[PDB]
């Protein structure tokens, strides 16, 4: 409510660790938790996979 949770990747990113997600620019994400500020927990609408993503790499859509 009020807060937007659908995001789009602005750049390509390759997971560095076992916890983070890799993605293509243009890939959409449902955000599961954004309370930490640097790393957000999310789900890829493309693979159905779950994991962390850098918040500075994605932008709000719709």
């Amino acid at each position: 409510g009020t807060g937007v949770t659908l995001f789009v990747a602005l750049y390509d990113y390759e997971a560095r660790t076992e916890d983070d997600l890799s993605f293509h620019k243009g890939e959409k994400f449902q955000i599961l938790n954004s309370s930490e500020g640097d790393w957000w927990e999310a789900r890829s609408l493309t693979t159905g996979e779950t994991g962390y993503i850098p918040s500075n790499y994605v932008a709000p859509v719709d």
Partner: peptide, 10 residues
Amino acid sequence: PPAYPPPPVP
């Protein structure tokens, strides 16, 4: 949350 810093934006 990985912490090892998100790399700066391009």
